[PDB]
Design a protein around this motif. Structure first.
Motif, PDB file in Angstrom:
ATOM      1  N   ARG C  51       0.808  -1.258   0.044  1.00 46.12           N
ATOM      2  CA  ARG C  51       0.101   0.062  -0.085  1.00 46.12           C
ATOM      3  C   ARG C  51       0.796   1.347  -0.170  1.00 46.12           C
ATOM      4  N   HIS C  52       0.070   2.434   0.025  1.00 47.03           N
ATOM      5  CA  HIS C  52       0.818   3.660   0.178  1.00 47.03           C
ATOM      6  C   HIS C  52       1.728   4.204  -0.999  1.00 47.03           C
ATOM      7  N   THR C 218      -0.732   7.650   4.800  1.00 47.37           N
ATOM      8  CA  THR C 218      -1.158   6.467   5.551  1.00 47.37           C
ATOM      9  C   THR C 218      -2.095   6.535   6.514  1.00 47.37           C
TER      10      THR C 218
HETATM   11 MG   LIG Z   1       3.079   2.728   4.047  1.00 44.69          MG
END
Ligand SMILES: [Mg+2]
Ligand SMILES: [Mg+2]
Ligand SMILES: [Mg+2]
Ligand SMILES: [Mg+2]
Ligand SMILES: [Mg+2]
Ligand SMILES: [Mg+2]
Ligand SMILES: [Mg+2]
Ligand SMILES: [Mg+2]
Ligand SMILES: [Mg+2]
Ligand SMILES: [Mg+2]
Ligand SMILES: [Mg+2]
Ligand SMILES: [Mg+2]
Ligand SMILES: [Mg+2]
Ligand SMILES: [Mg+2]
Ligand SMILES: [Mg+2]
Ligand SMILES: [Mg+2]
Ligand SMILES: [Mg+2]
Ligand SMILES: [Mg+2]
Lengths: 104, 149, 271, 77
Positions: C51-52, C218
């Motif tokens: 993710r992110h 996040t």
């Molecule tokens: Mg992250």
RNA sequence: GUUUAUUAAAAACACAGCACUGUGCAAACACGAAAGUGGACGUAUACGGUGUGACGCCUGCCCGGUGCCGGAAGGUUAAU
């Protein structure tokens, strides 16, 4: 130029290569227009205390009137060589030529 | 895995022996190296009547052609002028293929599985000793001097 | 050189630039470039695996010599360049036969120095020689794990690895993490620390400076609903549970190494 | 595909039965392994993704017989 | 800056920053019965997760409970 006194302590199993080291170091000095005044192999000699887990070493004295650049190169040669154990360069006021009291 | 032998193996039997072995030892080493046949009774009647001496003759003429080669491996010196550093400490080593390259260039065209080395590289200029294993029994020695270029 | 910015605006209030004036103010060497298409953290299934990740400035890839195979041939250092793909600066070197390459720039390297790989190489910062030829106790980078595979250790801006021992075929290394690892003594290594040691001294100042670097925001797990995260829920700020992943795995302290293949190569763990 | 080339073994389906006799569908996979078999006649190694039962079959019948069966079946090796 | 397209734009989220912790590379982790792929054509000044949330002064006591880490002498203990 700058009078230096060089003594180094060789691993005794590399005692055969000692004149090859001396001839390279002398050709470094005279190639750098340096003088060599005395040059005294002292042979194998029993150490006062065991350096590097061994009890004897091969000693070489050498008195030199060279510029400091080739001496710093020579120190690095002693540093990266594993045959040479200890190296000591001591600056001297003048050029000495007389034999050592232990060369006698 | 009952298996008949085609050559003597140092811990179970000689040629013409029907010895139980493990399956991976027959299946991976002995059979693929021609040293043993699994003990089928068809193989037994195939082997014991005829090949009980046919494999003993080709194994003996193999040991006599090798033990002739080990005898002639008295050539005894190979000087390999490889690259080296100062005060020992060879730059470039002499390997198994390079030893076989140099006894080919002086003596027998020899292969790499016969060569016995405790270290093997010897990246060190000077003298050493090298044993061979051209047979299971007969070994040869050649003094090889690796010399700084 | 770190430069604290004057607070003419919030977002410049806390910015520390890392300014190196020796970097080349021009285009990189074109043959050594290639396309680096972004991913968004999405695999061949299109799903987000990590993710992110997303967005950021377009980046061309610089082909960097990690294998470092030009033995014997000396090379002079042409210029230092910026690499967006990595934290360390790269050096454009010119071999004698006319080949140009990119290497990782070491600490004290500048334009005009001479480097040389190979066994007969000298021992100065920049040379690459096998660690059976390298003295014990030296700091190296760009370290191979396997011979000829290419350097994989100590590639980040200020890293280095000390060589603490050697027992025949292996040398023992002190990694930057503190782990002591055995590597074969035929693996190549490059002398000296990696260059840009003050990279970690920068402060981005604002959120956009991370969005420039492709770092999407996040969302912390307790600000969610329980269908989304184990931490989610609450009628206020409630966290009456042990800290886990989004998948229910303990995070504060729990070890995750499960490699029984490489345990013989690990002398001591980090700590 | 988890299929023994020699015996034609195949993942079958069954149940995990608990102590409370809770039934969940599972699979029974064969113990397949890729193994190089030395064929002495063709004087080469042949890789077969074969179960250990099939390795017992090769140890009993011989690999030439089995590769004859695989050609009569019409299976590549 | 963002947010409940269509009753809530906020003190909520995010944020730069901080800390803990995992991870030595075929990395952890994640999507995938698998092959594989992302992480990353990166390599611990890196990546992931978690909490806090510029800056300034700070962050005190408790490991009994619940977790986690380490231990391996003893007790118990599965298939076999
Ligand atoms: Mg992250
Ligand atoms: Mg954050
Ligand atoms: Mg957040
Ligand atoms: Mg909510
Ligand atoms: Mg839940
Ligand atoms: Mg409350
Ligand atoms: Mg409460
Ligand atoms: Mg049912
Ligand atoms: Mg606003
Ligand atoms: Mg809106
Ligand atoms: Mg609304
Ligand atoms: Mg509204
Ligand atoms: Mg991958
Ligand atoms: Mg908060
Ligand atoms: Mg507190
Ligand atoms: Mg406790
Ligand atoms: Mg425990
Ligand atoms: Mg027990």
């Amino acid at each position: 130029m700058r009078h230096y006194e060089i003594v180094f302590m060789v691993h005794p199993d590399q005692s055969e290569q000692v004149p090859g080291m001396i001839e390279r170091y002398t050709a470094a000095i005279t190639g750098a227009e340096g003088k060599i005044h005395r040059l005294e192999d002292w042979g194998r000699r029993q150490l006062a205390y065991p350096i590097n887990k061994l009890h004897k070493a091969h000693y070489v004295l050498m008195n030199v009137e060279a510029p400091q650049e080739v001496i710093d190169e020579l120190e690095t040669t002693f540093r990266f060589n594993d045959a040479v154990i200890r190296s000591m360069v001591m600056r001297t006021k003048h050029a000495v030529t007389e034999a050592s009291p232990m060369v006698k | 895995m009952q298996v008949i032998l085609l050559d003597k193996v140092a811990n179970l039997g000689s040629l013409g022996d029907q010895v139980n072995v493990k399956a991976g030892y027959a299946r991976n080493f002995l059979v693929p190296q021609g040293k043993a046949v699994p003990a089928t009774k068809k193989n037994i009647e195939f082997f014991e009547a005829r090949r009980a001496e046919l494999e003993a003759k080709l194994a003996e003429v193999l040991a006599a052609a090798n033990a002739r080669a080990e005898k002639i491996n008295a050539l005894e010196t190979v000087t390999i002028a490889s690259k080296a550093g100062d005060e020992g400490k060879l730059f470039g080593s002499i390997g198994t293929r390079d030893i076989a390259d140099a006894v080919t260039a002086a003596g027998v065209e020899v292969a790499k599985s016969e060569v016995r080395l405790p270290n093997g590289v010897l990246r060190t200029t000077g003298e050493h000793e090298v044993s061979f294993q051209v047979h299971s029994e007969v070994f040869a020695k050649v003094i090889v001097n690796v010399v700084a270029e | 050189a770190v430069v604290k910015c004057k607070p003419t605006s919030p977002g410049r209030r806390h910015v520390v630039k890392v300014v190196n004036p020796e970097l080349h103010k021009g285009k990189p060497f074109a043959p050594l470039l290639e396309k680096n298409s972004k991913s968004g953290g999405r695999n061949n299934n299109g799903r987000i695996t990590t993710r992110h990740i997303g967005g950021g400035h377009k980046q061309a890839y610089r082909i960097v010599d990690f294998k470092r195979n030009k033995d014997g041939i000396p090379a002079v250092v042409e210029r230092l360049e910026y690499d967006p793909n990595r934290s360390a600066n790269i050096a454009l070197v010119l071999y004698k036969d006319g080949e140009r390459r990119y290497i990782l720039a070491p600490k004290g390297l500048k334009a005009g120095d001479q480097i040389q790989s190979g066994v007969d190489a000298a021992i100065k910062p920049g040379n690459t020689l096998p660690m059976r030829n390298i003295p014990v106790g030296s700091t190296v980078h760009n370290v191979e794990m396997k011979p000829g595979k290419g350097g994989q250790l100590a590639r980040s801006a200020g890293t280095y690895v000390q060589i603490v021992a050697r027992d025949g075929a292996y040398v023992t290394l002190r990694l930057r993490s503190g782990e002591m690892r055995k590597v074969e003594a035929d693996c190549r290594a490059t002398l000296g620390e990696v260059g840009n040691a003050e990279h970690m001294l920068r402060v981005l100042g604002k959120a956009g400076a991370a969005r420039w670097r492709g770092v999407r925001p996040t969302v912390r797990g307790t600000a969610m609903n329980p269908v989304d995260h184990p931490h989610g829920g609450g009628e206020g700020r409630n966290f009456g549970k042990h800290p886990v992943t989004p998948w229910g795995v303990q995070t504060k302290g729990k070890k995750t190494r499960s490699n029984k293949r490489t345990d013989k190569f690990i002398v001591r763990r980090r700590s | 595909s988890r299929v023994c080339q020699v015996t034609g073994k195949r993942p079958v389906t069954g149940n995990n039965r608990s102590h409370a006799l809770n039934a969940t569908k599972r699979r029974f996979l064969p113990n397949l392994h890729s193994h190089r078999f030395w064929v002495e006649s063709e004087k080469r190694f042949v890789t077969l993704r074969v179960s250990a039962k099939g390795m017992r079959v090769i140890d009993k019948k011989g690999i030439d017989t089995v590769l004859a069966e695989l050609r009569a079946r019409g299976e590549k090796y």
